Structure 1
Amino acid sequence: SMNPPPPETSNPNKPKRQTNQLQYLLRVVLKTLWKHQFAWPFQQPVDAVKLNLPDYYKIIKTPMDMGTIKKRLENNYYWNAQECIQDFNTMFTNCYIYNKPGDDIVLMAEALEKLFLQKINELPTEE
């Protein structure tokens, strides 16, 4: 099957606020995960046509990736930290559902998830 359009990243109709938690998610969390050695498969939507995986979007109906998350943060798409956290978690879950447990792609996601959880534990208080 062909690729779907990527996830929505900007909605001018959707209310916007800057907060220290959202700033942290972009400046610290997204930045640190992006730079990790294992980040590259997670930096853009899965191109299932290029990868010849016609079943990917038959199985994964809520795709997510860090390129999308970066743009969402830049476009003030999220009202709160939890909405952004959900997107990271969706990204990891998709990887765990689609791929055989223990495969290299899964180990990569697991490393990123461990780092993510460390940074979320250090999420600043709303202030």
Structure 2
Amino acid sequence: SMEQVAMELRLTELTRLLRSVLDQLQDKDPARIFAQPVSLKEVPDYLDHIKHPMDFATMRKRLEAQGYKNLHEFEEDFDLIIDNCMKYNARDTVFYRAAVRLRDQGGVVLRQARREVDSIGLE
């Protein structure tokens, strides 16, 4: 149907915006601490601690499959990256501190992304 096509165009448009958001968020992680999934070879007990692992590569895979239907879903996954890190790692670690900085700098980006999604009407 034409309605289905129109919905699909909206999703494609949302995916384009979220790709730009994802790139901007990842730029705030210059150390690439959050670029890849935590390796279960290097951290064999990780899943005992963290029940829903997340990272930027995994987000990008979901994104390019158009698997984010709205901004909330995307934000959920970004928050997992930060929140998982801040639980597994202690305050005095480079990992925890990187997550704090990513959260703080990312907030700016996500604030305007919400306005753009609303204004253009992408969800």
TM-score normalised to the size of structure 2?
0.78
Equivalent position of 1:102 in the other structure: 92
Please list every run of 5 or more consecutive structure 1 residues that lacks an aligned counterpart in the other structure: 1-14
> Moved runs in structure 1, 4+ residues, more than 6 A?
none
How many correspondences in the alignment?
Answer: 110
**Is the contact made by 1:45 and 1:65 (CA closer than 8 Å) also made in structure 2?**
yes
Equivalent position of 1:118 in the other structure: 108
The one-letter code of the counterpart of 2:95 is I
- Displacement of 1:115 after TM fit? 1.7
Which of 55, 65, 69 is the equivalent residue of 2:59? Answer: 69
The one-letter code of the counterpart of 1:33 is L
Please list every run of 5 or more consecutive structure 2 residues that lacks an aligned counterpart in the other structure: 1-6
- Displacement of 1:103 after TM fit? 1.0
- Displacement of 1:57 after TM fit? 1.1
The one-letter code of the counterpart of 2:25 is L
Distance of 2:16 and 2:92 partners within structure 1: 34
- Displacement of 1:26 after TM fit? 1.1
Structure holding more helix per residue:
2
Aligned identity (percent) is 32
For residues 67-93 of structure 1, what are the alpha-carbon distances to aligned partners after superposition, in whole Å with 9 as ceiling and x for unaligned?
011111111011111001000001110
Distance of 1:102 and 1:19 partners within structure 2: 41
Distance of 2:52 and 2:104 partners within structure 1: 22
Distance of 2:109 and 2:74 partners within structure 1: 13
